[PDB]
Amino acid sequence: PMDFLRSLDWTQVIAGQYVSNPRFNISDYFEIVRQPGDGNCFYHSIAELTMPNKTDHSYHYIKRLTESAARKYYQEEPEARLVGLSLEDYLKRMLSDNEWGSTLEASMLAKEMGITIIIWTVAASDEVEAGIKFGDGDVFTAVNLLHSGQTHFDALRILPQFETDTREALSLMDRVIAVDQLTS
């Protein structure tokens, strides 16, 4: 139970990025906090979990931190080689409304916010297909997201019975950083 979560076997495949394939049902360990399927649900899901007063607009802070992270990190992200756009053309697309966030955003955000993000993928049941972890923290301290369908992200909160640590939180400095991007 607690043993199970503590026994997750992560393999690092890319620097700072791991994968695992435990086989367990999301609903045995997590509450799924559903997010609207509007193309911004990656960032809704992160907001849900890092801003204790999240609304339907708070994702703007996460996207702005994604902009901040990109300016610092995109040029050196392996996955940016595949995305291929200049930083400027990428920001334009990434900041467009309803433009999905993905593994590249997760990678940069984990660095910008100094958090560990885990994406748990499922396909037509809630049994996990794979876990993908950005950052070196463990499941109890991570921002846990659920990815389902081809496209959709939801937030996951560890069930109270297993929750341990204090939680990751958008700092006040984060909101300042976020607002800074906006005005520039």
Residues 6+ apart with CB under 8 A from 97: 39, 40
Instruction: Indicate left, alpha or beta for 109 from its phi (over 0: left) and psi (-120 to 50: alpha).
Output: alpha
Q: Which region holds residue 69: left if phi is over 0, alpha if psi is between -120 and 50, else beta?
A: alpha
Q: Which domains does the chain have, with CATH numbers?
A: 1-159 (3.90.70.80), 160-184 (6.10.250.1100)
| Paired tokens of 18 | 């791991």
On whether the CB atoms of residues 8 and 139 are closer than 8 A, the answer is yes
Question: CA angle, 125 as apex, 146 and 156 as ends, to 5°?
Answer: 25
How far, rounded to the nearest angstrom, does the alpha carbon of residue 164 sit from its chain's CA centroid?
A: 20
Among residues 41, 44, 147, 174, which one is catalytic? 41
Amino acid at 49: L
Spatial separation of the C-alpha atoms in residues 1 and 28, rounded to whole Å: 9
Reply yes or no on whether 41 is catalytic.
yes
CA distance 42 to 107: 13
Q: Which of 60, 126, 138, 152 is catalytic?
A: 152
**Contact between residue 147 and residue 32 where contact means Cβ atoms under 8 Å apart:** no
Closest CA to 141 of 122, 123, 158: 158
Using CA atoms, how far apart are residues 158 and 168, in angstroms rounded to an integer?
A: 13
* 145 and 155 Cβ atoms separated by less than 8 Å: yes
What's the burial of 142, exposed, middle or buried (CB within 10 Å: 0-12/13-18/19+)? Answer: buried
Q: What is the 3-state secondary structure (H, E, C) of 107-173?
A: HHHHHHCCCCEEEEEECCCCEEEEEEEECCCCCCCCEEEEEECCCEEEEEEECCCCCCCCCCCCCHH
Best CA proximity match to 8, nearest among 107, 83, 116, 112: 116
Q: Which of 44, 147, 154, 174 is catalytic?
A: 154
